[PDB]
Write a protein that binds this ligand. Sequence first.
Ligand code: VRY
Ligand code: VRY
Ligand code: VRY
Lengths: 237, 300
Amino acid sequence: GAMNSSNYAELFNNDIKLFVDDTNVYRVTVHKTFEGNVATKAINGCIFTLNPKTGHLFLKIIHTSVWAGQKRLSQLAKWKTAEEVSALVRSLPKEEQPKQIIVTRKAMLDPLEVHMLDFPNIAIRPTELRLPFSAAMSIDKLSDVVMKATEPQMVLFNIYDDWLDRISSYTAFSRLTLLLRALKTNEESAKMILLSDPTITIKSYHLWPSFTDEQWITIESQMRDLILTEYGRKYNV
Amino acid sequence: MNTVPFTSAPIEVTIGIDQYSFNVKENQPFHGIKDIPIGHVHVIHFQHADNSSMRYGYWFDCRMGNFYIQYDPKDGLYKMMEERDGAKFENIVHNFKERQMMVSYPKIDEDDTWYNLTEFVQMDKIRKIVRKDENQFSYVDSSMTTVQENELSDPAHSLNYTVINFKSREAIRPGHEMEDFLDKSYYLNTVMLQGIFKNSSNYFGELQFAFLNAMFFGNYGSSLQWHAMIELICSSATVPKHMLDKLDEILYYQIKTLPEQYSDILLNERVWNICLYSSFQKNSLHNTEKIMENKYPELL
Ligand SMILES: COc1ccc(Cn2cncn2)c(Cl)c1
Ligand SMILES: COc1ccc(Cn2cncn2)c(Cl)c1
Ligand SMILES: COc1ccc(Cn2cncn2)c(Cl)c1
C-alpha cells in the first residue's frame, strides 16, 4: 500500500527500492505571441529516480525533442516517465532491480504499473508524504546538465555525496529532504546559506559543499529557521 | 408453448421465471408453469421464504429436452431434472393442465422485454460458462464466484466468464502501453472479438448473461463481468458501428428492467459516469443515456 509517516523507515532497510518523481519531466515557459495570444515553449526536463538507501540518483534528462509533434503533453509526460523507468529497470541486472518503486504522485501509478507488467514482483506504491523532490532543479549541477543537454541522456549522481561514510541513510535522507524543502520554500535564502562561506567548496564530484559535521549542524539549523521563517512570512504568524 | 411441471411445492418459496416473480405457499397445490415461449433461453429461480439467503435457479431451453422441478428434502432445494421418456412426460403435463394446477407465462402484443434481454444468449454458451456437462440445463446461485474472482475456491462450481483485465499483458501490446491503455480498441477488436469471442454476438451474449445473473441472483462476480464488458467497449475509440447501436439497445432494456430499489448495488457509479460522459462512446448511447438520466440521475 501507501508509504506514509507510519512506515517511513522501510526506505532504509535492505530491500532495493527507488523513488520516482516526475514533477520536472515536462517543463514550459509561458509567453505571449505577437498576436497577443499565449503559447508555451518547452525546456529540457528530468526524471528524478533515487535509491534512498544508497543515494544513487538516476537522472534521466528529457530533451525537448521528445515532445515534438505530440499532443496532451502533461499526460504523455507521465507515460514517458514510466517508459524510461521501465527501461532503467530492464537495463539493470536482476539482483540490482528494485523490489519496490514509490511514485511521488498518484497519477504515475497506472502508467508505471502498465509499463512494468513484465515485472509482476515489483511493487508499485504511492506515498502520502509531501516530499520536496521538485526542488532537485535548484541543485546547480543538476540543473546545469539538464539545461545543457542536446539529446536524451542519463546521468548518474550520488545525491548524498560522501555523507554515508559518516552518517546513516536515515540521517542522510533527512538532511537531503531538509535541504530540498528549504530550496523549495525560498531558493535564494537557501542557496545563500549553502555558499556564503567561500572557504567551504563543492568537490568536483559532489553536489553539496564539504561541510564538517559541526558545520552541517549549523547549516541544518539555518535551514530549519528559513523554513519556519518563510512559514511566518507566508501565513503571518 | 412449453411447460415446466413441478412434482409439488413442499416449502414456501418465491418462484421467478425470467423477469417475473410470484409466491407459492407451503404445500400449496402448485404443479408448475405453462405457456413458456419456445425459442428463447429462460431462467427459473427460487428464494425460500425462510432463508432469503441463496437465490438460486436454472437456465434452460425447452427445445433441448423435457424439464421439471421436484423438491429434494435432503439437499433442501428445488431441483431441475430431465425426463427422457417423452410419453410419460406429456401424460403428466396433460394431467396437470386439465386440473389447472399450473400458472401461465403471460403474453402481450406490446411486450419484447425478455427477447431484448436474451437476444444473443445461447444455451450452448451458458453451458461453457457454467460447467456441468451431464445436464442440459445450468444451475447458478448468489454465491458462485467467477474464475477471475477465484484467481484473485472450488473450480467445479465457478462461473467461467472470459477474464477481462485492463492492466494485463493480454490487454497491452509491448510498445503501445499508453496507446492501448487509453484506447482499448486492440483488446476489444483483436484480442476479444477476433480472438476469443469470434464475433460480437457471442460477446453480447456473455454480457447479457452476466447482467441477468447479477440481477436475478445478486451474483457479485457477474455484475463485475457485466461492467467490464461495457467498459471495454466504451473505452475503445474504434468499435463497429453496428455494435454501438446494438449496445445502446441492450443496455437500454437492462436499465429499464432493473428494479428501482436495486440500482444502488447493481450499478457501478464509476463505470456508468465514465461510459456516458467521459469515454470515447459518450455520445453513442443515446437511448441508454436518456433512460439513465430520467431514472437514476442520482447515480450520475
Ligand atoms: C412434475 O413432473 C414430473 C415429470 C416426470 C417425473 C418422473 N416420473 C414420472 N413417472 C415416473 N417417473 C416426475 Cl416424478 C415428475
Ligand atoms: C408464470 O409467470 C407468472 C407471472 C406472473 C404471475 C402473476 N403474479 C402472481 N403473484 C405475483 N405475480 C404469475 Cl402467478 C406467474
Ligand atoms: C471482470 O471484472 C473484474 C473486475 C474487477 C475484479 C476485481 N475485484 C473487484 N471486486 C472483487 N474483485 C474482478 Cl475479479 C473482475
